[PDB]
């Protein structure tokens, strides 16, 4: 029903079309993934599949985590995350210890990507929320770039909780929707995303079958 | 990249040399103009025996822009001077012969007379 798989961004490039065009493509290394858990509604309250990825030496992994992996029946992995299903028909095909690779996706189908946006730092109001600066001339008095007025006076005499102003951006989960997959492989699990996805080089991204059009 | 108060070349033989942009058209808060965008421009100076006199308000389409504009194959356009073509309500030029080259975008923008009559399409 709904497919998904984890991946890693290493670069971002372009590839050529059969319609003779050129399309930018994001390198996504969807390395091999192993099923470490199954979630059943009667025993837990929902249906989902938990996946682990990466290679970590057995001594760098925390001992309870290593024990949990041994109980699951697979060697230790780097990061762990789950994919949520919606019916037990898709649940029944997944079993503990099963291995998933990138060929499960067929080219021509939209995909959705989820990752952590870049760490931009504590930024000003105008850069963050796209405000407009005032004149840097005509007698400005050191308020060149700072927002200014916030609300009424003595009624309500406050700020309107939720007002858009200064704060740190980035370093949070961000999703991009309805993306081309241009080309997939079977050899070493490399998946291609036409466009630009959020995250970092050598960062963590998860790709899921598109909900919008699929 | 044509804005308000933008200062442009004329690529026509209507009798006008230099036009000033009036507005960029296409929608609310229309902000930039690209190759194949119909705009409105006013004539600053003209040939003494020209068809149009200075001060007229005439619709125009820009054909030669300095800023890069991508095509479907990644093709970016840098020209040497901002130029437009004087156009009328029937999507037709006011002149009869054209100076300089033109871009392919006019063909997709249905302007057939200009692209056909231009000395070379690029």
């Amino acid at each position: 029903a709904r497919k998904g798989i984890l991946g890693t961004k290493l670069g971002m490039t372009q590839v050529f079309d059969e319609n003779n065009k050129v399309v930018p493509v994001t390198v996504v290394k969807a390395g091999p993934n192993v099923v470490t858990r199954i979630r059943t509604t009667e025993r837990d309250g929902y249906s989902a599949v938990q996946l682990a990825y990466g290679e970590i030496s057995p001594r760098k992994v925390i001992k309870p985590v290593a024990g949990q992996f041994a109980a699951a029946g697979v060697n230790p992995r780097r990061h762990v995350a789950e994919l949520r299903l919606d019916d037990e028909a898709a649940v029944a095909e997944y079993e503990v210890g099963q291995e998933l690779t990138a060929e499960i996706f067929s080219d021509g189908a939209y995909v959705d990507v989820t990752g952590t946006s870049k760490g931009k730092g504590f930024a000003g109001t105008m850069k963050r929320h796209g405000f407009r600066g005032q004149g840097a001339a005509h007698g400005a008095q050191a308020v060149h770039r700072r927002p200014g007025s916030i609300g009424g006076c003595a009624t309500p005499g406050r700020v309107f909780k939720g007002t858009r102003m200064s704060g740190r951006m980035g370093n949070d989960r961000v999703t991009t929707q309805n993306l081309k997959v241009h080309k997939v492989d079977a050899e070493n699990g490399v998946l291609l995303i036409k466009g630009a996805i959020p995250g970092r080089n050598g960062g963590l991204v998860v790709v899921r079958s598109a909900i919008k059009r699929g | 990249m044509i804005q308000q108060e933008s200062r442009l070349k004329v690529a026509d033989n209507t009798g006008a040399k230099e036009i000033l942009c009036i507005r960029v058209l296409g929608g609310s808060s229309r902000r930039y103009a690209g190759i194949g965008d119909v705009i409105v421009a006013t004539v600053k100076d003209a040939i003494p025996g020209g068809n149009v006199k200075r001060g007229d308000v005439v619709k125009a389409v820009v054909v030669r822009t300095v800023k890069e504009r991508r095509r479907a194959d990644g093709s970016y356009i840098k020209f040497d001077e901002n130029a437009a073509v004087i156009i009328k309500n029937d999507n037709d030029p006011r002149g009869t012969r054209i100076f300089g080259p033109v871009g392919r975008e006019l063909r997709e923008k249905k302007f057939m007379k200009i692209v056909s009559l231009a000395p070379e399409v690029l």
Binding site: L10, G11, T13, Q14, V15, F16, D17, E18, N20, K21, V22, V27, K29, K183, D185, E187, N188, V190, L192 | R64, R70, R71, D73, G74, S75, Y76, I77, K78, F79, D80, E81, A83, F99, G100, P101, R104, R107, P119, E120, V121, L122
Partner: protein, 113 residues
């Protein structure tokens, strides 16, 4: 190691000839017009080239009637019927960023001999 090499090789295109910035080249452009296919000729001067593995990319710029014209294709473009460099050009800058503000007799390109 650009781990995408064994994925690039699937669509990598052969018979790629050598070219450098500042070289005079022409490109044939496949254009569909009313469900009819035809071929155009675009002559110009390469001003920049940035490789990408399978994604080696370059620009082409020409001069017509004293006003420059450009088309930009990546190397392995299936639209490019042929990459026929006319004469190899010698340019001090491998990127021709300054070619935007040289007019007429200024914007000529040196020819290697």
């Amino acid at each position: 190691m650009n781990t995408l090499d064994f994925v690039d090789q699937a669509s990598l295109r052969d018979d790629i000839p050598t070219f450098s910035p500042g070289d005079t080249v022409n490109v044939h452009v496949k254009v569909i017009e009313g469900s009819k296919e035809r071929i155009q000729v675009f002559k110009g001067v390469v001003i920049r080239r940035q490789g990408g593995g399978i994604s080696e990319t370059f620009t082409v710029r020409k001069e017509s009637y004293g006003v420059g014209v450009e088309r930009t294709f990546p190397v392995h473009s299936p639209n490019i019927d042929h990459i026929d460099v006319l004469t190899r050009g010698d340019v001090r800058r491998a990127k021709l960023y300054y070619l935007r503000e040289l007019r007429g007799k200024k914007a000529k390109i040196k020819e290697k001999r």
